[PDB]
Design a protein around this ligand. Sequence first.
Ligand SMILES: Nc1ncnc2c1ncn2[C@@H]1O[C@H](COP(=O)(O)OP(=O)(O)NP(=O)(O)O)[C@@H](O)[C@H]1O
Ligand SMILES: [Cl-]
Lengths: 206, 326
Amino acid sequence: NFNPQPVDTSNITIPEKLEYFINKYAEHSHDKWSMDKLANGWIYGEIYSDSSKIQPLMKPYKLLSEKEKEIYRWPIKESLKTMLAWGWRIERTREGDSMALYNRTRRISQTSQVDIDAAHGYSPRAIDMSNVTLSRDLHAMAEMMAENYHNIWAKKKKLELESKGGGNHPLLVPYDTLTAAEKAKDREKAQDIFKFLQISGYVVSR
Amino acid sequence: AVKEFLAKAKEDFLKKWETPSQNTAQLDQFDRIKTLGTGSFGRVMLVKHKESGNHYAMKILDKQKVVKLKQIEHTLNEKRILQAVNFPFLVKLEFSFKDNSNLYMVMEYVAGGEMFSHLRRIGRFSEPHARFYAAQIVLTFEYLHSLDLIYRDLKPENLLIDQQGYIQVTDFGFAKRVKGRTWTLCGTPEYLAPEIILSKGYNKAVDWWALGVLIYEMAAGYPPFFADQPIQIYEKIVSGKVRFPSHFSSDLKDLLRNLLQVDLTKRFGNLKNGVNDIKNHKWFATTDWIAIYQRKVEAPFIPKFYEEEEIRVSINEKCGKEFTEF
Ligand SMILES: Nc1ncnc2c1ncn2[C@@H]1O[C@H](COP(=O)(O)OP(=O)(O)NP(=O)(O)O)[C@@H](O)[C@H]1O
Ligand SMILES: [Cl-]
């Protein structure tokens, strides 16, 4: 009976004003990717080789091609299209939370050439949104997005198996029957975009 | 007329700069009233000059502490600058001397406030209030630059608000006399001009950049480039990206686009018309430059007007070598 039907976004147009957010979140996501590659012992390298862990995409976002940017941009746009297809409103309320996060402590005239030199290279440090809290309503909305990511995966998987006449996946079940550990990936993706919208000055409402 | 003073201001500065005054008073010429504050290097005492009856703030710097904190060159440079300059928005050194243990900087007594604590308490200044303080920095940098001094440490922390609510620059550790280019990395991360970070040399235009940062911080309540760590601040500065609060006026945004200009060759204050590109900007239209200089404008904020330990001066000269020029 399990019949996942994620909302059709095929005819949604993202307003041009959200381009600012899509670019900012895509760059954050790329920097987070690079940090994780540095932490697993990968390093930049002009020419790609899986041997010795060299990754030529471990460079600033602005240098990436359209194609390489799309790895981040495509899912972000898909996420926004779902919200818009549900009739949710996405409004930029303020700027990127400048004051609240600014350290207002008295500043000493201390500088290091070591930091200065490091700033010439690619030195990714994506914001840690671990401190960032969602309202009760925004948590429920994030859970609905998480569920919809599962349903997108599930419908695609089901059509694949139906097309072949074979295959079986144990996670082809209703989202809520999943364990926390099984939900965690869709939960973290949903929560990530809601948290990044928030720190970027956006309010999602329904 | 105008040519007369700019030449004479410079001749008086150069004479004092090239031959600094030393030991222009001594400790026994002051009555010690009380300690006003404790600094990095010692205490600031309220003193009465015995002959004039004037009160002064005597900064006492323990030479050994200045050496230990590696502030030798900064302390010498600040005193050399302060005994040579004369401008309404620069703190007044009235006397300096040294003895076996201490350096003494006898400063004009100012029962004022600090720009840093006032701005942080108020949160942010209105554009008219920010403009009043900014005009004083513009005139102060016009003066310093006319002497070939690069200030290169502007920030709220270095500005006091005096008894009449005007600002005075209080710190000259980094200021340098230079014609053309210099390279030393100094300042505070949030106020560094991009050409400092690019580490290929810079000139007095870094001061006009810093003016942009201060005006932004005064009007917004936070500076234009910030981050949990310096590397990310340096990246944002050279990145050439800034975002203005939606409450900034169009005139303020235009001025700051031209002061926070990453290309020092297009930066206001650094073009053919020099300081006049700033003084004649629409954001300063209401500014009476001469009346600010003459301190005739009513300031928006007037600050509100057994602890003793004795000064022991050693029998033996401490750090004679390091402070020979003081
Ligand atoms: N001219 C002055 N008139 C009156 N009080 C003064 C004067 N200068 C300093 N004080 C007092 O002395 C205190 C400490 O001295 P100050 O010169 O500010 O220290 P500092 O060593 O420069 N510290 P910092 O600026 O953080 O690097 C101040 O907070 C004032 O209360
Ligand atoms: Cl809903």
